[PDB]
Design a protein around this ligand. Structure first.
Ligand SMILES: CCCCCCCCCCCCCCCCCC(=O)OC[C@H](COP(=O)([O-])OCC(O)COP(=O)([O-])OC[C@@H](COC(=O)CCCCCCCCCCCCCCCCC)OC(=O)CCCCCCCCCCCCCCCCC)OC(=O)CCCCCCCCCCCCCCCCC
Ligand SMILES: CCCCCCCCCCCCCCCCCC(=O)OC[C@H](COP(=O)([O-])OCC(O)COP(=O)([O-])OC[C@@H](COC(=O)CCCCCCCCCCCCCCCCC)OC(=O)CCCCCCCCCCCCCCCCC)OC(=O)CCCCCCCCCCCCCCCCC
Ligand SMILES: COC1=C(OC)C(=O)C(C/C=C(\C)CC/C=C(\C)CC/C=C(\C)CC/C=C(\C)CC/C=C(\C)CC/C=C(\C)CC/C=C(\C)CC/C=C(\C)CC/C=C(\C)CCC=C(C)C)=C(C)C1=O
Ligand SMILES: CCCCCCCCCCCCCCCCCC(=O)OC[C@H](COP(=O)(O)OCCN)OC(=O)CCCCCCCCCCCCCCCCC
Ligand SMILES: CCCCCCCCCCCCCCCCCC(=O)OC[C@H](COP(=O)(O)OCCN)OC(=O)CCCCCCCCCCCCCCCCC
Ligand SMILES: CCCCCCCCCCCCCCCCCC(=O)OC[C@H](COP(=O)(O)OCCN)OC(=O)CCCCCCCCCCCCCCCCC
Ligand code: HEC
Ligand code: HEM
Ligand code: HEM
Ligand code: HEM
Ligand code: HEM
Ligand code: FES
Lengths: 239, 379, 52, 56, 74, 164, 379, 54
């Protein structure tokens, strides 16, 4: 039984006021769209979100133009194809959950829009799950078509090994190391479930300094006003 | 001709309630948690309204609406996490306030104490209603378990669960009625808080020493306004740290998964501020006994004025009772932790002992200790 | 009313309170421009137009 | 003392007190925003979107 | 309960000074630190034990859970 | 007094900054969200639309026809009078650049979509209740009460024309 | 020993409010409407709660949810039509109350009068906002027109309509924010009504004669409870007549149609209680002047305490003022009828003339008639 | 796949056209209004619709 608690990796964003690596965010969106998007969905995160965080405006426009998404009723009422735009959400795999479950043996690939914020462990858990596939030990022979992942609850996951070495050619020129790919996709997922991380830490900085000023001054005002009470020399002169 | 502060109708009430109200001169910081609570209401109500302007209560789109709030609305995540962590701080301040009232003997104010118990029940139900609204896995399943808990009532029990819970399971009707009640209740809380202050005012306030402070009353406005302002700013510090560095620190990650009636999460726990009752529910094996013990865990507060045997209202000069009170607090944290953990061998017995010790302190140990100290002080 | 406010000492009070009320008006105008971030006014002032 | 001049000029009248507070807010918002943003970008150099658009 | 029907007091004199003449922090550290140390000495004797026994209970429960959840040789 | 009130002044300016930076957050929160900004008010069209065509797109919540009004139909629109029109609207205010016409795609009678290159006059025809429309965007007569609505389009960079 | 009625704080407040409060004996039925309003408030709020328990604010479910309430929900149609006709009856009572205040010089209670004007404003806003919630053709289209009226405001005005709409036009964001504000506002109305009652209770009500009735005052509980009971029963008689026999009488049938933004309705009109000020808006050609006249048509109530010049507070002894008041009432009826009708000949001229006559009577004819009134009585 | 099954009491009334645009394109571009609320939506009620049909 038991379960591996994901080791606390030294993420660049793990700092109290340290942000995400936006280049890593772009390289992690690339791996998502290349291998992850073939079976997983991101729903809420749309092509418009990528503008200003990982991709520029025209790059995101081209990215949305590459994929064809399904648009509403035709002039005859036919449900037709159409090139994607920024307003469009991330295109999804097999349309209904039943088809996704049937195609992928009997398991539903969860949406990654919140997967790094819905699992106890977050980025550490996701990174360990991806780079943790190991040969099953003695006496724990699993099904056919199943794969032993110690970090997965139940130690029996339904993934064909997602990230293997030299799978995707990064546009920047970074090597296709399995660790590099896993780190990039993990950072992308952390951005995906927390699309305010940069601005949240900015507000944290501003609030910290603002009230590092405010507390001493408000306390000084309180002591200034209360100082009359805290210096009342009393007396008692009964006859 | 005459001062408007003490002649205008509304201004007279404001003046004699907050400006020129004679308050004890030596109230500690623990009393300040009163004002914070009220602030923790307003600060959280204003946020709560702004989510209501982007949250659709339909089950098929509640979670997507919440994600749209956190992802699309201008500064929506600020409002959402401020709301959640403000509820958490509201419960922190409520527990601290009840601890202050129990400690310094304020529970001898009777009407204010019972009104406070009713306020506690109302807000404690309101938070449970609010947790369901995002329609996450924990939201749906915790609502299922907590509502099914009511089925232990004899005879009419199931029928009541047929009525409150909408029949069926936790489904479309349940979400809408939970939203409506979640919206209406805090205004009732506001009215009851106004009644709470109204009952508090003619008695004054209980100073830490427990003695009457009628010989040292000072005006409220010059001193306690700025004192509660500083306290509210400290509460802002804690709330903003929570909201802005670890937004989901006091929360279950699985809530960020859309509710699915086809999969029970590995752990089914309510929010952190409910576990102190949840563990009690697990203490008694019987379902009906669990309901009664869980309700009595909060109903025991109104019995405190009756169970006061010490000749001193306060607790500053009662060291043996002080040890008992701190044992009670430690038992509360132990119960919370036990409720957090699942039901195996190491936790069942600890939870049972913690609940027994809780009740034994409140109804048995504290009055006997007070009598012992009265004897030990030649009275 | 009309005539009862039309007195010499009343205009004396008006003259006395013109500075304080007039520059309370300036306080309010500056506060409004500040709160709304009125680019029509804030553009001309130095060291703040950089925010745009 | 300079503080004496401050009280005599800007602080005696509560209305000019409000004016001083308002102008102080005018300058202080911009100063704090610029300083905090500069600190933020200094800590995370080569990580924010502002530090990477040069390539694209 | 407004000021005036509060209590009856006789031969009590209270001296107070303007807030603009007293320093807001009269001997802040040099006098506060001994007082805080005295308050801690007074209260810790009755405050600490119930909280520390919670810590041993918590550690005991955690190790008991982990050892009972482990496999036994059989 | 100067020092004691300087403390208060600095406290007050800090509180004012915080109060603005909170109330502005709330006010902008009630303002228009990002999705409507990035889904509705962006209507760039490439000049791929050739002369004499009406490829229509469903933007905001209504379709819109991008007419490539050629010289011929331009001079029919010029020749057609203004006064006897039900709601007189000359082609000048109807459309800025003669070669391209931007107008909504919901006939004002009861809705539907007017099919193009029909309606006796030539431009548009709503077949629901047979309302023929003026080619310039107006209506000469018919069941429809008033002319087709014209949006706040902009003609900048004719190759890439944006509709508001 | 002392009376719990007048020693317990809550009971003391209730006693001084409507148990032992002195009241004029000659109070006619025209004052009963006051209590009726309170009843018509509570009977509204409760019903609203139940409606909020089966309403999903969204442009894809609002009409469907309302239909589901009407048909499927056990006794849901009765709640829905109860709500609609209760809002209509609330406005009937509000208009009758304002007429009573004008007639008997009740605006001499300046604070109560101003608080009443604020309450009236809030009620109009609440009803306008609530009529959007069913999301019918009339709801959406009327909302578009009314909110777009704010575009006439100079400078900021256009941005405001983008702010209120939550975007470029009335859409789902507007619907949900309207739902949230429609929820919150009635409790603000309740608080303002409590303040309005406090101000009135300070000085006491005014009898139809206008002379002070301090010499002849009767206790409120023995008499003016059962009379208000009878008034509320009569109001219920009318209201259930409307609900149970002609449910969609005042409401436009076009609401029972999904809100399609591709088809303008034949005539866009607000409720019967909104048609008078909307007709005033129609009368003025200028857009900004139209909004100014619209807001002034209600704000003019605040000017009434200043415009009174007759030495008699009430109107029982001022027959010329009575004729002028009835001319004003007929003018308001004409405004409502014109607002119902389209802006064509001769409705344009009739609406314009009646709009001028409204302000002309309120500002000019009444004070000049009062001067002639005083001159006719040696004083 | 979307499978077809015999209708039951739970189901609402069948919709003759899959989507509204299909209905308009099928008939003439006009949309047959929903008959659920048609009587309560037209000024005149049943007397209207009857008068139309005859
Ligand atoms: C160093 C030794 C360890 C820490 C101090 C605690 C200790 O050992 O003995 C407490 C020791 C003995 O208690 P006491 O002072 O006799 O009685 C309780 C105080 O009156 C209660 O406190 P008070 O009203 O005299 O003064 C407020 C006090 C403590 O304020 C509070 O306790 C309330 C606000 C924080 C509540 C949550 C944290 C507890 O504030 C602080 O100590 C620091 C600022 C905290 C933020 C709020 C301002 O008191 C102190 O050291 C200061 C107050 C308690 C601090 C905790
Ligand atoms: C829930 C959210 C969290 C809680 C929210 C806040 C609730 C409580 C708010 C209490 C409050 O605002 O003021 C009372 C509370 C009690 O202090 P106090 O009003 O100066 O009265 C002290 C007593 O007279 C007793 O004075 P003493 O005999 O300890 O000696 C004088 C003085 C000097 O002693 C010290 O300052 C202690 C030595 C270390 C410094 O004591 C203190 O300042 C004690 C607090 C030290 C921190 O304020 C604080 O605890 C100050 C917080 C720290 C300074 C501001 C931030 C930097
Ligand atoms: C003896 O001590 C006391 C305090 O602080 C030590 C206080 O703060 C206050 C004053 C408190 C407040 C103004 C706010 C806190 C709590 C209340 C119950 C007041 C009423 C409620 C609200 C302000 C919140 C709801 C109102 C609105 C949305 C009082 C009266 C007091 O008596
Ligand atoms: C969650 C509450 C405490 C305050 C009570 C109300 C006091 C008041 O009415 O203050 C306004 C004041 C009224 O007059 P006052 O100075 O009180 O003198 C009355 C003499 N009979 O007003 C005045 O004296 C003048 C009118 C106000 C001037 C304000 C100027 C600055 C405006 C910014
Ligand atoms: C951790 C919780 C305590 C934090 C503050 C530090 C502390 O232990 O304070 C103890 C303090 C003792 O001071 P006092 O009540 O005046 O009694 C002196 C008797 N010689 O006594 C107190 O602070 C009593 C405060 C009681 C209410 C707050 C604590 C319980 C909150 C959860 C319920
Ligand atoms: C109502 C119709 C009946 C009616 O008004 O009867 C007349 C009656 C007379 O009242 P009384 O004061 O006895 O007259 C003495 C004359 N020597 O009553 C009156 O003349 C006064 C009636 C008006 C005052 C109460 C308001 C009732 C509603 C009137 C319509 C308001 C419409 C909105 C106005 C704004
Ligand atoms: C060709 C198929 C396929 C590819 C490629 C794939 N996945 Fe999955 N994934 C699945 C299936 C099937 C499941 C369901 C297994 C289960 O029940 O947990 C799954 C489950 C997951 C889970 C849920 C684990 C949990 O805790 O329950 C995460 C996280 C995940 N995938 C991330 C990824 C990431 C990150 C990548 C690539 C960078 C990836 N996947 C590539 C098919 C795939
Ligand atoms: C007693 C006071 C209240 C408490 C303690 C409270 C608590 C909560 C909590 C904990 C949630 C879940 C938040 C989350 O899971 O992220 C919630 C949801 C919600 N509450 Fe409240 N609430 C209160 C009053 C109100 C009020 C007054 C409103 C409306 C003005 C409101 C509107 C909402 C809405 C719309 C949601 C759903 C959106 C969300 O989950 O954040 N609540 N509430
Ligand atoms: C809705 C949350 C609550 C609010 C807004 C509230 C408000 C207040 C306020 C402002 C005070 C005065 C400050 C103080 O003495 O602490 C107070 C005092 C008091 N409250 Fe509460 N309260 C709340 C909940 C409770 C609860 C749960 C109880 C306990 C059952 C309670 C019982 C008391 C008592 C006994 C006092 C008197 C304290 C004293 O004078 O020593 N209140 N309340
Ligand atoms: C001040 C008293 C109130 C007035 C004047 C008022 C007015 C209205 C009106 C005119 C409608 C539209 C009725 C229609 O569809 O024809 C409506 C709908 C609604 N109101 Fe209210 N309302 C009041 C109080 C409340 C309260 C307190 C709530 C919340 C508890 C509420 C919730 C609703 C809901 C959910 C709807 C939509 C259901 C429907 O339209 O039938 N109302 N309101
Ligand atoms: C929210 C709706 C309202 C409620 C619940 C309400 C409540 C009451 C009640 C119960 C009375 C005493 C009975 C009576 O004199 O009729 C009263 C009196 C009064 N109300 Fe209102 N009222 C409301 C709206 C208004 C409005 C719109 C006005 C006018 C601006 C107004 C002005 C007055 C006046 C002048 C009196 C005193 C009448 C007299 O003493 O003869 N009220 N109000
Ligand atoms: S809708 Fe176009 S002709 Fe009737």
């Amino acid at each position: 039984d038991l379960e591996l608690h994901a080791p606390s990796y030294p993420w660049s964003h793990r700092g109290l006021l340290s942000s995400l690596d936006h280049t890593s965010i772009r390289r992690g969106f690339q791996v998502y769209k290349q291998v992850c998007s073939s079976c997983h969905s991101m729903d809420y995160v749309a092509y418009r979100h990528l503008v200003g965080v990982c991709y520029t405006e025209e790059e995101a426009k081209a990215l949305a133009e590459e994929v064809e998404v399904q648009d509403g009723p035709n002039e005859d009422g036919e449900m037709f194809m159409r090139p994607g735009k920024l307003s469009d959400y991330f295109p999804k795999p097999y349309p209904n959950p039943e088809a996704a479950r049937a195609a992928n043996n009997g398991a539903l690939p969860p949406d990654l829009s919140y997967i790094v914020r819905a699992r106890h462990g977050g980025e550490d858990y996701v990174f360990s799950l991806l780079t943790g596939y190991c040969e099953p030990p003695t006496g724990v022979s699993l099904r056919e078509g199943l794969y032993f992942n110690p970090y997965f609850p139940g130690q029996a996951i339904a993934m064909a090994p997602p990230i293997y070495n030299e799978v995707l050619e990064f546009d920047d020129g970074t090597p296709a190391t399995m660790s590099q790919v896993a780190k990039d996709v993990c950072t992308f997922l952390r951005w995906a479930s927390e699309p305010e991380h940069d601005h949240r830490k900015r507000m944290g900085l501003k609030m910290l300094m603002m009230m590092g000023l405010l507390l001493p001054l408000v306390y000084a005002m309180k002591r200034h006003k209360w100082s009359v009470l805290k210096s009342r020399k009393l007396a008692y002169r009964p006859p | 001709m005459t001062n408007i502060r003490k002649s205008h109708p509304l201004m007279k009430i404001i003046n004699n309630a907050f400006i020129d109200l004679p308050a004890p001169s030596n109230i500690s910081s623990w009393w300040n948690f009163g004002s914070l609570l009220g602030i923790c209401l307003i600060l959280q109500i204003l946020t709560g309204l702004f989510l209501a302007m982007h949250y659709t209560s339909d089950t098929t789109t509640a979670f997507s609406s919440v994600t749209h709030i956190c992802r699309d609305v201008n500064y929506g995540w600020v409002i959402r996490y401020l709301h959640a962590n403000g509820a958490s701080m509201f419960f922190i301040c409520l527990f601290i306030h009840v601890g202050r009232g129990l400690y310094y003997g304020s529970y001898m104010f009777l009407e204010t104490w019972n009104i406070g118990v009713v306020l506690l029940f109302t807000v404690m139900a309101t938070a449970f209603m609010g947790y369901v609204l995002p329609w996450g896995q924990m939201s749906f399943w915790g609502a299922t378990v907590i509502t099914n808990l009511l089925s232990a009532i004899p005879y009419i029990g199931t029928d009541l669960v047929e009525w409150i819970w909408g029949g069926f399971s936790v489904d479309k009707a349940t979400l809408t009625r939970f939203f409506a009640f979640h919206f209406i209740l805090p205004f009732i809380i506001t009215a009851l808080a106004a009644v709470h202050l109204l009952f508090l005012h003619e008695t004054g306030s209980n100073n830490p020493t427990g003695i009457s402070s009628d010989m040292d009353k000072i005006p409220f406005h010059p001193y306690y306004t700025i004192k509660d302002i500083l306290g509210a700013l400290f509460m802002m510090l804690i709330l903003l740290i929570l909201v802005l560095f670890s937004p989901d620190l006091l929360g279950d990650p699985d809530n960020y998964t859309p509710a699915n009636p086809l999969n029970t999460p590995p752990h089914i726990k309510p929010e952190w501020y409910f576990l102190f009752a949840y563990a009690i529910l697990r203490s008694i094996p019987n379902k009906l006994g669990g309901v009664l013990a869980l309700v009595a865990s909060i109903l025991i507060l109104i019995l405190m004025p009756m169970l006061h045997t010490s000749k001193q209202r306060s607790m500053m000069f009662r060291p043996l009772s002080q040890c008992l009170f701190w044992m009670l607090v430690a038992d509360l944290i132990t119960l919370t932790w036990i409720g957090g953990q699942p039901v195996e061998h190491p936790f069942i017995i600890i939870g049972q002992l913690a609940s027994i010790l809780y009740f034994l302190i409140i109804l048995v140990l504290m009055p006997i200790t007070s009598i012992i100290e009265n004897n030990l002080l030649k009275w | 009313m009309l005539s009862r406010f039309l007195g010499p000492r009343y205009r004396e009070l008006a003259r006395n309170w013109i500075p304080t009320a007039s520059m309370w008006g300036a306080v309010g105008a500056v506060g409004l421009v500040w709160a709304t971030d009125w680019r029509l006014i804030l553009d001309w002032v130095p060291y703040i137009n950089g925010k745009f | 003392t300079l503080t004496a001049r401050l009280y005599s000029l800007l602080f005696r009248r509560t209305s000019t007190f409000a004016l001083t507070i308002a102008v102080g807010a005018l300058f202080f918002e911009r100063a704090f925003d610029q300083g905090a943003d500069a600190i933020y970008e200094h800590i995370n150099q080569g990580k924010l979107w502002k530090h990477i658009k040069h390539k694209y | 309960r407004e000021f005036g029907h509060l209590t009856r007091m006789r031969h009590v004199i209270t001296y107070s000074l303007s807030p603009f003449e007293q320093r807001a922090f009269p001997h802040y550290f040099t006098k506060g630190i001994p007082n805080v140390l005295r308050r801690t000495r007074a209260c810790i004797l009755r405050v600490a034990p119930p909280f520390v026994v919670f810590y041993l209970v918590y550690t005991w429960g955690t190790q008991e859970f982990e050892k009972s959840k482990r496999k036994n040789p059989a | 007094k100067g020092f004691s009130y300087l403390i208060t002044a600095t406290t007050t300016v800090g509180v004012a900054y915080a109060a603005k930076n909170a109330v502005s957050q709330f006010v902008s929160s009630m303002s228009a969200s990002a999705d409507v900004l990035a889904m509705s008010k962006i209507e760039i069209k490439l000049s791929d639309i050739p002369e004499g065509k009406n490829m229509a797109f469903k933007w905001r919540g209504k379709p819109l026809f991008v007419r490539h009004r050629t010289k011929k139909e331009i001079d029919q629109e010029a020749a057609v009078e203004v006064s006897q029109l039900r709601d007189p609207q000359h082609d000048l205010e109807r459309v800025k650049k003669p070669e391209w016409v931007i107008l909504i795609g919901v006939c004002t009678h009861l809705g539907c979509v007017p099919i193009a290159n029909a309606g006796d006059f030539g431009g548009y025809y709503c077949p629901c209740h047979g309302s023929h429309y003026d080619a310039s965007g107006r209506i000469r007569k018919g069941p429809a009460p008033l002319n087709l609505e014209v949006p706040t389009y902009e003609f900048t960079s004719d190759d890439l024309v944006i509709v508001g």
